[PDB]
Design a protein around this ligand. Structure first.
Ligand SMILES: Nc1nc2c(ncn2[C@@H]2O[C@@H]3COP(=O)(O)O[C@H]3[C@H]2O)c(=O)[nH]1
Length: 341
């Protein structure tokens, strides 16, 4: 009736939410008035046409969505036959189920199937329970429900389909992300760069070693404490002109500091952050084929010594070159391998 034609348009204008659950609570509550039912709910038909699911009952959003086979009772037949039914028609099991969900005595019921105008299939079963007034839902109630979804259904089907597809998509992209990571980490420069400076660390007898690749006015610790950081989360970045690291990144010349603390250029920040203390620092640059500093590296703290020797200083030179020569043979072999293929 135009009485309900106006009430609907208002419901429609009020179905602006992007979440299917919220769009249901509003439609459900509309019906609980126009039918005088205590609790309403939509039993959504799955894709495989094998189950019924429910997420919202009345104004209560079930913490977990409930689902059960269409086999499991008389309701599944409504999906096939497209004819409403009532309490008197439900199997004992149906009542038991709907009651486990509703959490109360099931005194009255009307179940109108919702038919897609697009596919003409039963998309869901709209249910009215326990009428406060009568004990049987009218014939007028079957029409108001039916009426509502003629205008209301599509937006609910879309908002729900949208969220299903989105959740599916993410789950998939995520799994793809796992895989991508597992393979794009192979040609990571920080992997050989790491084992190289780990060699230097041994030969020079330092406690730790770290490599800092320059990132446009911000040195990034790709290798730190001997291991490949492996995450920009607990990263380690710094201004490309500060400290000894930055001073080498700027002069491109090896620096051997016997006492970090007592040096004008030493940056204590990293230490009082990590809670580690830097005694000596033997920092060498890592240049590209353009002979330009692309990153810097350092051997930290001499073991069984007051500082890094002249010999150690030589390793720094040799490893500075070997470092660049290795990034090279790697750039060339990366191509003369992916091209061959
Ligand atoms: N804990 C830790 N500190 C490091 C490592 N490498 C360099 N540093 C410290 O971080 C500092 C940043 O630049 P500094 O000139 O202050 O010199 C560096 C060291 O004190 C490393 O592998 N581990």
């Amino acid at each position: 009736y135009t009485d309900h034609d106006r009430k609907i348009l208002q419901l429609c204008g009020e179905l602006f939410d992007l979440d299917a659950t919220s769009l249901q609570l509003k439609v459900l509550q509309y019906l609980q008035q126009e039918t005088q039912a205590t609790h309403c709910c939509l039993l959504l038909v799955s894709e495989d046409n094998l189950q019924l699911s429910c997420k919202v009952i009345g104004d209560k959003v079930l913490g977990e969505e409930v689902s059960f086979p269409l086999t499991m009772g008389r309701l599944g037949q409504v999906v096939e036959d497209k004819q409403c039914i009532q309490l008197k028609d439900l199997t004992s099991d149906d009542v038991q189920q709907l009651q486990n969900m509703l959490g109360c005595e099931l005194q009255a019921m009307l179940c109108v199937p919702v038919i897609s105008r697009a596919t003409d299939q039963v998309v869901a079963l709209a249910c009215a329970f326990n009428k406060l007034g009568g004990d049987f839902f009218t014939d007028e109630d079957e029409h108001v429900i039916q009426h509502c979804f003629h205008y209301t259904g599509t937006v609910l089907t879309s908002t729900l389909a949208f969220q299903k597809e989105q959740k599916l998509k993410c789950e998939c992209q995520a799994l793809l992300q796992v895989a991508k990571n597992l393979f794009t980490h192979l040609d990571d420069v920080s992997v050989l760069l790491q084992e190289i400076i780990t060699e230097a660390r041994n030969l020079s007898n330092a406690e730790i070693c770290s490599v800092f690749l320059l990132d446009q006015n911000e040195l990034v610790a790709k290798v730190f404490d001997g291991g490949v950081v492996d995450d920009e989360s607990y990263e380690i970045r710094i201004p490309a002109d500060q400290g000894i690291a930055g001073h080498v990144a700027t002069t491109g010349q090896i620096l051997n500091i016997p006492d970090a603390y007592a040096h004008p250029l030493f940056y204590r920040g990293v230490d009082d952050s990590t809670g580690f203390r830097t005694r000596n620092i033997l920092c060498f640059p890592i240049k590209n084929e353009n002979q330009e500093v692309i990153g810097v590296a350092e051997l930290v703290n001499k073991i069984n010594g007051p500082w890094f020797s002249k010999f150690d200083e030589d390793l720094a030179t040799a490893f500075s070159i070997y470092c660049g020569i290795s990034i090279a043979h790697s750039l060339l072999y990366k191509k003369v391998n992916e091209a061959q293929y």
